[PDB]
Amino acid sequence: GIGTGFPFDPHYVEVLGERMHYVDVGPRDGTPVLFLHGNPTSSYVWRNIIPHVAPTHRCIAPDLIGMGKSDKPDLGYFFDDHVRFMDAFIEALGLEEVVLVIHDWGSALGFHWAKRNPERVKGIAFMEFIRPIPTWDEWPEFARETFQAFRTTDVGRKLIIDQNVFIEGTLPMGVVRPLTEVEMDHYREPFLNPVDREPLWRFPNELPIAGEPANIVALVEEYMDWLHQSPVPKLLFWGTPGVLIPPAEAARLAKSLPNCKAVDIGPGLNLLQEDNPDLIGSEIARWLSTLEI
Ligand SMILES: CN(C)c1ccc2c(-c3cc(C(=O)NCCOCCOCCCCCNS(C)(=O)=O)ccc3C(=O)O)c3ccc(=[N+](C)C)cc-3oc2c1
């Protein structure tokens, strides 16, 4: 079955006075492949993808500040905080050119970094990514009242911070197949202490939905503008019914984005890596062999 283990040796780097944890496997030479997770996951979400790529390419998978095994400073964990730390992480490792593999809030980080540094990105593989959502009618109906509630400082903090609903409920509701107890405990581990759950609540409050928050809407529209023009090689994975990306949106993008291959993973919601890791990893490995890296 789908692997539940996390076999990777820990690596740490000090970034803006904080320790960040990252996976680092594969050959030392060549262009590295940088894997960026989102909310409410960690490098754990890549555990079954990376072994398809690590035979032939360096694989780097950081834990975002405040998540996974990375340090947990007392921040608001706005997107801007994550931008600052990830910019600094990339420079701290001395990375030059990279290929991005990104998901969920990792995709906003990766696309925003790529748009600002396009000479350094040799391809982007992405799935269930952050786009401006025009209206709440575009959010899945089965999750709509809850995500509206999440975006409040009263009910939303009760649910996410006090009661850990984003880990105990929203996360499994983002995977078609059932998560095992071992997998749930891996996703629970960074957040056993409620005071450490700020990123879990700030992230859905940063989602650009119906024009709010206006600043994130503008930032995400900017990198989407770039994505519609840039020749950067693109690999888009999508599933049915999806969450952030419905199938009809993936089909539009597969035609409108230049140099874009789109891959149907079958049933999927948000954590597509948990529903079809074999296809995602094997398609990434094949696609990499076609890039000038
Ligand atoms: C401890 N106590 C107070 C609760 C409270 C509520 C629940 C709930 C629950 C979830 C929800 C709920 O989370 N609805 C929302 C689902 O949305 C799914 C689609 O988006 C996946 C996105 C993934 C992350 C994207 N990240 S990003 C870009 O946003 O940063 C609503 C009501 C309930 C309910 O039951 O009352 C559980 C639901 C399922 C479950 N099982 C399958 C084991 C366990 C649940 O346990 C719960 C425990």
Numbering used by the authors: 3 to 295
Mind quoting what the paper says about this structure?
Taking advantage of the crystal structure of HaloTag7 labeled with tetramethylrhodamine (TMR), we used computational screening to identify tentative xHTLs. In brief, putative xHTLs were designed by varying the terminal alkane chain length (C4–C7) as well as by replacing the chlorine atom with other functional groups. The binding mode of TMR-S5 and TMR-T5 to HaloTag7 was further studied through X-ray crystallography. While the S5 moiety occupies a similar position in both the docking experiment and the crystal structure (rmsd = 1.0 ± 0.3 Å on five atoms), the TMR shows a different position on the HaloTag7 surface in the docking experiment. The alkane-PEG chain occupies the same hydrophobic channel but presents a different conformation. This difference in binding interactions might contribute to the higher affinity of T5-based probes than those of S5-based probes.
Here, we introduce exchangeable ligands for fluorescence labeling of HaloTag (xHTLs) that reversibly bind to HaloTag and that can be coupled to rhodamines of different colors. Here, we introduce exchangeable HaloTag Ligands (xHTLs) for the reversible fluorescence labeling of HaloTag7 with rhodamines, opening up new possibilities in bioimaging for a powerful labeling tool.
